């Protein structure tokens, strides 16, 4: 018996969980009303601090908190890309038997947990989520990853899942969870879909094909480094530039004030997805003196810019590596968060010349959603 099977998008920066239920799917909110919650993890003297808690107390706990733990599960302590991740992650890493591993104080003392117990605590809550909202106990579910994960990503998310009480039965691929979501799999002919996903810490885009409800990832590209939190540290740096500018206080290293700045620069971007200007407003900032700067949608496109057309470069290497042009593709699936941003999606429309993307799914959820659609079968 598999009960009711959840669907789990376990992200980068945040995590959304869905279920299929009586002809309907949904996203499910967390304690907080938040229908999707940061991929973060706590530890305090009292506490074990699991999305909205443990992002909110980051600056005042920042070596006991943990985050982009995607970025190293299932990979081993020498690898390339784990030594470039460790050197821009505040908290410690350690080499357990090969594998990175992070160190807080959980007591009083140092603990040890591996990518696998953290993403476990994630999945966790996203389960608990699930067992309020349908009243049951939940044991089953249907969790997402990137198409570029090898066995050993997907069978550590797998085993994150068993350290939450969940038997993940299918390891699922992120753009075809999307693709999934907006019914594609259901095609009356062949189609080649490209899913351009704009994330908070990364961005993919991959070409899919689809036949007689087969999918097959045909290429995959784009940047495991550019995301929405870049776009927010742009922001950031003109805020210290024009607070340095009126008051004389340079708060480069002042990471308490830092991280008001990445919270505040976040909302001010998220604003202008909808608004031409914004106020950013932080009373008391640093030493009893107000922040008070305006923000424009063109000032932000302005600042963000190269970081949009630099997405563009991988969807041209896509269709090189599957040997399509631009007139073959029947969908572009656009998913992730930060494709919510206008210029992001005026620009990739111009690139496919002027063909619309498919966005009427919720693109933060859009992921979660597939993944519950699959579940539901399993159901
Ligand atoms: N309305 C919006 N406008 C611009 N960016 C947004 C908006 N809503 C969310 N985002 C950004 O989306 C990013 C998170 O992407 P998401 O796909 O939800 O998570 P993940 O990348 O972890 O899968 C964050 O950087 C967030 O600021
Ligand atoms: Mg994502």
Do not use: W
């Not at 909110?29 to 107390?57: C, H, M, W």
């Not at 087969?214 to 003109?238: C, M, N, P």
């Amino acid at each position: 018996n598999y009960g009711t099977v959840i669907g789990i998008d376990l992200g980068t920066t945040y995590s959304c969980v869905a279920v299929m239920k009586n002809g309907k799917t949904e996203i499910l909110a967390n304690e907080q009303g938040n229908r999707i919650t940061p991929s973060y993890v706590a530890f305090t003297d009292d506490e074990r601090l699991i999305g909205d808690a443990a992002k909110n107390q980051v600056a005042a706990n920042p070596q006991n908190t943990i985050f982009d733990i995607k970025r190293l599960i299932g990979l081993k302590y020498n690898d390339r890309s784990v030594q470039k991740d460790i050197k821009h992650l505040p908290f410690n890493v350690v080499n357990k038997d090969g594998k990175p591993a992070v160190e807080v104080s959980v007591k009083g003392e140092k603990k040890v947990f591996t990518p696998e117990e953290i993403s476990g605590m994630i999945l966790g809550k996203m389960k608990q989520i699930a067992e309020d909202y349908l009243g049951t106990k939940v044991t089953h579910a249907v969790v997402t990853v990137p198409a570029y994960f090898n066995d050993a990503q997907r069978q550590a998310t797998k085993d994150a899942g068993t350290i939450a009480g969940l038997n993940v039965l299918r390891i699922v691929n992120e753009p075809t969870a999307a693709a999934i979501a907006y019914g594609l799999d259901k095609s009356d002919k062949e189609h080649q879909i490209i899913v351009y996903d704009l994330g908070g810490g990364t961005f993919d885009v991959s070409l899919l094909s689809i036949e007689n409800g087969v999918f097959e990832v045909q290429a995959t590209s784009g940047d495991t480094h550019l995301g929405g939190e870049d776009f927010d540290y742009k922001i950031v740096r003109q805020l210290i530039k024009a607070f340095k500018k009126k008051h004389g206080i340079d708060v480069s290293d002042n990471n308490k004030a830092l991280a008001k700045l990445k919270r505040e620069a976040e909302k001010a971007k998220r604003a202008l997805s909808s608004q031409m200007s914004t106020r950013i407003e932080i009373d008391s900032f640093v030493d009893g003196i107000d922040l008070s700067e305006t923000l424009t949608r063109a000032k932000f496109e302005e600042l963000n810019l190269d970081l949009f057309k630099k997405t563009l470069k991988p969807v041209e290497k896509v269709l090189q590596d599957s040997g399509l042009e631009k007139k073959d593709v029947d969908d572009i699936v656009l998913v992730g968060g930060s494709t919510r941003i206008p210029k992001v999606q005026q620009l990739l429309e111009s690139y496919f010349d002027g063909k619309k993307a498919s966005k009427g799914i919720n693109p933060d959820e859009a992921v979660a959603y597939g993944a519950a659609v699959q579940a539901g079968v399993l159901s």
